[PDB]
Amino acid sequence: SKEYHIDEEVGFALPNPQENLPDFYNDWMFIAKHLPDLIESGQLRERVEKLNMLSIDHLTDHKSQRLARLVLGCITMAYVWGKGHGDVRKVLPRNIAVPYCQLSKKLELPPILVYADCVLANWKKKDPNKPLTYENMDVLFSFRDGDCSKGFFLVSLLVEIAAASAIKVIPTVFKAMQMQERDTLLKALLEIASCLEKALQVFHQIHDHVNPKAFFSVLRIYLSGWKGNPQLSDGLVYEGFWEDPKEFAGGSAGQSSVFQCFDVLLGIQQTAGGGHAAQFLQDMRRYMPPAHRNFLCSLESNPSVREFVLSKGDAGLREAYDACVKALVSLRSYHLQIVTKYILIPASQQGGTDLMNFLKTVRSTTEKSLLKE
């Protein structure tokens, strides 16, 4: 590939993000490094106003700028939702709203916490000379004590690094098609399916590191946005930056590029149709880094691997392509059982069928693309 900011070892996630802003921004990071104690003791929402407007011009590196996107990303999320019980804040102060919105429009991201922030730029190696395992990694910023966000964010990242190992052979696939090298194409497609089968194994780790009570009842509120959300009926007001309140969608893993990249590579029409699911995934691309957004657009400009394999009438090539489509149906059927345990069941203990049909539609169209036609 060219420079869509892809790391051969890590992929779309940010490789080794820096852990601390420059000492100018010390007073920012203070609220960011201490949100658990800060909102439990009720000291959070006013310490925001105690801040004065820092300028973004001394964040020199991309790693520096994106780390600041994370600290301001969570600082706003903790401000708007607060305790997490219903006390809502419908307007951000301006000494925090316009630093965020400026660096957001410089990085071309919406001024909200996106998946690229709280996962891809939100980790560190405990001991730098170890493998990237959950035992050796740690999240840089959490919202509340017992959030399980360490397990939730990193297990999310861990299977992203797992499937990103398949990105490296995507050029091999398109090479083998155009130069009509049948065998290497079949071994490239099998290696694609290997990673997605292993990303399902890494997905198993979420049971050990997140419990359903915490996720649904503390972590889910802090990651929800103010688009189509009654608590901020028509969005959040940005003092000094925008006249009116603007609506933005909360974090989703639909903003990850690998979890849309395999759907376009395999000719799976996730974004086709005027459907709710297609519109959701198409819109979530706006919440991806501009380099990653340009990477999906770049994949869509290639010939369909699905049409190539079906034309050749090769039982070998078709079985390998189905393996990838199967490995995706697996990752989404298993996700369905996890949404069952971590959202469905904790909701019946305090309408939501729309949540399950979306994920079933995205799997339904994935299952249709199998070479059973």
Ligand X SMILES: Oc1ccc(Cl)cc1-c1cn[nH]n1
Of 88-96, 170-178, 180-188, 250-258: span binding ligand HEM (CB under 6 A): 250-258
The binding site for a second copy (CB under 8 A) comprises: 4, 105, 108, 110, 227, 246-248, 269, 272-274, 283, 286, 290, 293-294, 297-298, 300-301
Tokens (6 digits) for 311: 């034309």
**How far is it, in rounded angstroms, from Cα 15 to Cα 125?**
10
In angstroms, the CA 150 to CA 158 distance is: 11
**Residue 218 interacts with ligand X (CB under 6 A): yes or no:** no
Closer residue to a second copy, CB minimum distance, 22 or 228: 228
Q: Nearest distance from residue 266's CB to ligand HEM, in Å?
A: 13
Residues 89-118 that bind ligand HEM (CB under 6 A): none
The residue number with the shortest CB distance to ligand HEM is: 253
List 33, 168, 332, 360, residue binding ligand HEM (CB under 6 A): 332
Instruction: Kindly report the three-state secondary structure assignment for every residue of 217-250.
Output: HHHHHHHCCCCCCHHHCCCEEECCCCCCCECCCC
Q: Residue 42, class by beta-carbon neighbours within 10 Å (0-12 exposed, 13-18 middle, 19+ buried)?
A: exposed
Which residue is it, tokens 């880094």? Answer: 289
DSSP string, 73-120: HHHHHHHHHTTSSS----EE-HHHHHHHHHHHHHHT--SS--HIIIII
- Report the residue number, 253 or 323, with the smaller CB distance to ligand HEM: 253
**Residues annotated within a binding site for heme b:** 335
Q: Rounded to an integer, what distance in angstroms lies between the CA atom of residue 59 and that of residue 24?
A: 10
> What is the contact surface with ligand X in residues (CB under 6 A)?
115, 118-119, 153, 156, 159, 163, 196, 199, 223, 251-253, 258-259, 262, 328, 331-332, 335
Task: Give the interface with ligand HEM as residue ranges (CB under 6 A).
Answer: 155-156, 159-160, 203, 206, 210, 215, 252-254, 256, 259, 332, 335, 338-339, 342-343, 355, 358-359, 362
